[PDB]
Amino acid sequence: EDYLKCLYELGTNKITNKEIAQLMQVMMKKLLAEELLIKDKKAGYLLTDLGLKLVSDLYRKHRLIEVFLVHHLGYTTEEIHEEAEVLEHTVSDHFVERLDQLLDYPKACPHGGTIPAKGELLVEKHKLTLEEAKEKGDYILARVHDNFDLLTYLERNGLQVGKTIRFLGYDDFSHLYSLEVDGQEIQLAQPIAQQIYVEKI
């Protein structure tokens, strides 16, 4: 249940049984027999299609709640941190189905995340992370990871989804990515550039 969510996140290298303890504190043969995952040597654990569905539903539930709460209840990043996951875990599929219709089938959450159709699989429109970029030109911040501290971080440093980012370059030894935002300069660590997606133009 709650673990699969984690297993899909680190999917975007290698998976350890020593890495499972750290992000969740303290399965497997259950996940294996409920056929949600299989074991890989190269990747450690890959989610079966039964998984990725079960999980692409969770992102749908989550991202729709997020749109509703942000667009229509006025919520701010702090408040979504407080309330969002409790009712996310309470609201029925029926609720989510009708919310989808009220909101007129939005394709993205406020943070740039794609909102998979029901019974369908999660395939993000924006996969181009900053870390993984090359050309030093003008870009567009196009998705951010859903997480609080990251959002806080960026909100503090004036980075907003949809805004225009001039990518200055990566320093090979420093380990610092340079940005030009609102006519000013910024230094982002790697782990913070690993969670932020761009698109050229």
Added chain:
Amino acid sequence: PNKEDYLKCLYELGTNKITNKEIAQLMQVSPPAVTEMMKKLLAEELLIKDKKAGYLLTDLGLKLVSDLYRKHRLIEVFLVHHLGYTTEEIHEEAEVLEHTVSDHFVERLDQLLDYPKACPHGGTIPAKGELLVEKHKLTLEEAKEKGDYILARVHDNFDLLTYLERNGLQVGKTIRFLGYDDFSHLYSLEVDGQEIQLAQPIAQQIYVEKI
């Protein structure tokens, strides 16, 4: 089955002398678990013992009742008006959201809904912190004179609501009161030119207003 559900009970139960027995009945609970709750309600200062009325509600209990109803009615309005919920669908879902959503949610839902002054069942929706005062207090059973009547409010109660829809009684309909019977103990309604007999327990929950 928490303290809020007991207050709501007590609250409408006094729309007379409330007994620990009646509570235990209406709440479907242990007589030992009643005394336990009134101990808390008492101490939490939500009500005081009283000889004529059993328990009276303190302004604090009153304000708490006003929230319960705000929350319940606003959710209701949102579910049906915005999400096309059905009487049945609300019976299965409305309650668990009330036990769950914050008060910010409710304060914002209210803004979204453009501050509706009534849930769809006639039940009025108080401002935040305003004491609850139903617009429609005139129940069918205390309806004196015969004639033409707008059916203005009904209780949410899913059993009662099923009953109403299963007889084409809907809020905002014009209702013809043919009148109480003295021995029959029956209320006669012409509704859509069709006669209908209501018992005392159901007349008690329909609210009307003479048009």
